[PDB]
């Protein structure tokens, strides 16, 4: 029995350098293989091709980087949707239908401020990177859309260095106020888009400053009877308001994006602002339950909108202030799984690592957790397992569990709850989960698992992963095989010898710079079958430290935080290698509290990993699903059954 495995990305990206891996097994001496991308209507036309040599010196594994040139694609509007991936050699010929996307670059629109007043000039530049996170000198078109949906300006600029500086957009003297949209796009080749937002608000001179200070940013069971609110008001700078009238109206809000709200006409009224500070207490129960919902269970994830108007008594001036929403919280904790694929491997202990966070998404320690579970076998015969209990580790927030299941189990319906000593049964956190068994026709299963689930996997170190299969035909497996993916491209591949005398074996992996944002590891072995060879696979998600290829560091001499106006100061910029640097100096007061908004600088780590075509923590229902969830299509003579019509990844 001789097998071949062709690994490619789930989708081909026009203009991208797509790396195609070939790993053959059972073949001796040396032989050659041709990898090719052809047109879906005609396999006569060749978008690109590469020759790879396979030998014992090569361990019968090689790699080839292919590129679908944009200029080869026709230039009528109706885009190409499928291509042919083809491998031809002396021994075999297999082809496959591949979808393509014209999304290939990334467009980050950086405006200096997110909020503007009339007559100001908006400074805007665009960072444009290709799929391989490289400068890519492509010309870019910016469009400006006003709050009424009118395209009011369009300007294109050539890109020289990967940073594209555009002329400043002058806000009119009396402009249209509201939320403006900027849309970035490429002029010729790709369909990639970028989008940013900025509000234009009219400046109004305030008589005084009004501040509202709640006891907490969330409302738990302890403050459901009393919620302290401190309302301050002061003139410009250090000066403070002597005497005033404070009027407070309260409302219930569904979400902060929608400006709709449900008032509570039982509001507090006529308190005294004395020497700058006033205080009130809000009885949540009384104010809601006559005018709205009966219970606090129906108040979970809704918000409490607060509006305050302060009318100073001496001069009669009026100023308004508002708190958009204080989220009602039913349980002080929220649960989420960490590094636990929702798939069962029959015969292998199934691990569950729960993680506890508070309303500010911070890891809470010392929290006891109770785990219950139901099991369903192939005969639909349910079995209720014995409950287990752990306590949350205070170094990472994790509460670990191990479950020993019968070999015949197929579905595991397990439910997790917190058991805090000071929480009522209603105020506890509860989450349910389901794990389905991996399906194999030879009763052959593979389970990989990465014991270092708390270290960041620092680049330069080594990844000691344990590959444990449980199956028959164990002592006829020759090797293990691996593919390492990051940012939607296969960066590594290889093979490790399987020891015929052990059950488990440690696989060592040097962690490289290609793996720095995120990585995915796919491990598989080939079980030989009389009728046909079978691929048994599993996958895991590797979270790796966010480290720059050319680390930038900016410093100010002098270094104290307090400076004087007009002070001559020096800025020191240092990079690992020669790099362009886009600088900005923004008044931090423009950000403050943000409602439904993300900082454009910290927006980059999340917008970059949309190119990871994988989802979840790993695993799959079968071999094809394991490959699919890692963002991979595969070609094999071992397995005939492939994923049909799976045009896009999850």
């Amino acid at each position, epitope marked *: 029995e001789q097998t071949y495995v062709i690994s490619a990305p789930k989708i081909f990206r026009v203009g991208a350098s797509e790396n195609i891996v070939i790993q053959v097994y059972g073949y001796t001496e040396a032989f050659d293989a041709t990898i090719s991308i052809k047109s879906y209507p005609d396999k006569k036309f060749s978008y690109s091709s590469g020759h790879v040599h396979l030998s014992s010196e090569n361990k019968f594994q090689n790699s080839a980087i292919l590129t679908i040139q944009p200029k080869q694609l026709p230039g009528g509007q109706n885009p190409v949707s499928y291509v042919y991936l083809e491998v031809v050699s002396k021994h075999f010929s297999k082809s496959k239908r591949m979808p393509i996307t014209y999304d290939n670059g990334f467009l980050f629109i950086h405006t200096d401020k997110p909020v503007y007043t009339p007559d100001q000039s908006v400074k805007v530049r665009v960072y444009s990177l290709n799929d391989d996170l490289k400068p890519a000198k492509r010309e870019t078109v910016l469009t400006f859309i006003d709050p009424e949906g009118s395209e009011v300006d369009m300007v294109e600029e050539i890109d020289h260095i990967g940073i594209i500086s555009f002329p400043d957009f002058k806000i009119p003297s009396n402009p249209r106020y509201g939320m403006w949209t900027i849309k970035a796009k490429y002029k010729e080749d790709f369909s990639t888009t970028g989008t940013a937002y900025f509000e234009v608000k009219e400046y109004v001179l305030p008589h005084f400053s009004v501040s509202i200070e709640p006891e907490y940013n969330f409302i738990g069971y302890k403050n459901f009877k009393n919620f302290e609110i401190t309302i301050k008001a002061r003139y410009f700078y250090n000066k403070v308001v002597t005497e005033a009238d404070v009027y407070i109206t309260f409302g219930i809000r569904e979400d902060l994006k929608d400006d709709q709200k449900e008032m509570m006409q039982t509001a507090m009224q006529n308190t005294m602002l004395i020497n700058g500070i006033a205080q009130v207490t809000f009885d949540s129960e009384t104010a809601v339950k006559e005018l709205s919902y009966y219970s606090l269970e129906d108040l979970n994830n809704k918000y409490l909108y607060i509006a305050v108007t302060v009318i100073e008594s001496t001069g009669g001036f009026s100023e308004e202030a508002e708190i958009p929403g204080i989220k009602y919280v039913l349980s002080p904790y929220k649960l989420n799984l960490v590094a636990t694929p929702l798939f069962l491997k029959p015969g292998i202990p199934y691990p569950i690592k729960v993680q506890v966070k508070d309303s500010l998404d911070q890891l809470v320690g010392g929290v006891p957790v109770t785990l219950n579970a139901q099991t369903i076998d192939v005969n639909q015969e349910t079995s209720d397992l014995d409950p287990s209990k752990s306590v949350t580790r205070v170094d990472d927030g994790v509460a670990s569990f*191990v479950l020993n299941l019968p070999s015949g189990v197929t579905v595991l319906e397990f439910n997790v709850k917190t058991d805090a000593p000071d929480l009522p049964e209603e105020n506890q956190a509860r989450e349910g989960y389901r794990a389905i068994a991996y399906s194999s026709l030879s009763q052959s299963y593979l389970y990989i698992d990465w014991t270092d689930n708390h270290k960041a996997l620092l680049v330069g170190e080594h990844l000691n992963i344990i590959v444990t299969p449980k199956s028959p035909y164990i002592d006829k497996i020759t090797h293990y095989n691996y593919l390492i993916l990051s940012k939607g491209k296969i960066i590594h591949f290889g093979t490790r010898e399987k020891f015929s005398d052990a059950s488990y074996q440690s696989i060592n992996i040097p962690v490289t710079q290609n793996m720095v944002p995120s990585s995915r590891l796919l491990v598989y072995y080939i079980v030989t079958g009389e009728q046909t060879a079978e691929l048994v696979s599993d996958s895991v998600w590797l979270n790796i430290e966010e480290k720059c290829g050319n680390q930038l560091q900016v410093h100010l001499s002098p270094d104290a935080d307090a400076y004087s106006p007009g002070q001559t100061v020096s800025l020191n910029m240092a990079t690992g290698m020669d790099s362009w640097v886009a600088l900005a100096a923004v008044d931090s007061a423009v950000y403050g509290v943000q409602r439904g908004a993300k900082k454009p600088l910290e927006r980059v780590f999340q917008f970059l990993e949309k190119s990871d075509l994988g989802c979840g923590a790993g695993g799959g229902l079968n071999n094809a699903n394991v490959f699919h969830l890692a963002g991979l299509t595969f070609l094999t003579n071992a397995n005939a059954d492939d994923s049909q019509e799976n045009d896009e990844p999850c």
Partner: nanobody
Amino acid sequence: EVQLVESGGGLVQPGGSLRLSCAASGRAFSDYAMAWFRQAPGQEREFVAGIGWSGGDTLYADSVRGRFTNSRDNSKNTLYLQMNSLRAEDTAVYYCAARQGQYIYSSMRSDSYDYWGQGTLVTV
């Protein structure tokens, strides 16, 4: 809090057989993760052998695999390491170490471990 006491270490001929015992104080071991490590003088500490969960997983270093056998008597709350075919490379102080939590696999990393015995010397 966990206190840990190793015993059984001694002088042995190359080729000899020695059993190390790890006592846990203040915990019943349960399904927690526990391991053996070694440190030679002037060298960084290295994993030797481990057993995650209770008895269903068990991991050894490649240096010692096939020579050393790790076992647990749950009733006694003791860990045992049988050591056969010992060589001069096995001379080291041996430390029992344990983790907090129900981990199926043994971590090979000294940074993973929080409680440490005082150690026992093995001279081959």
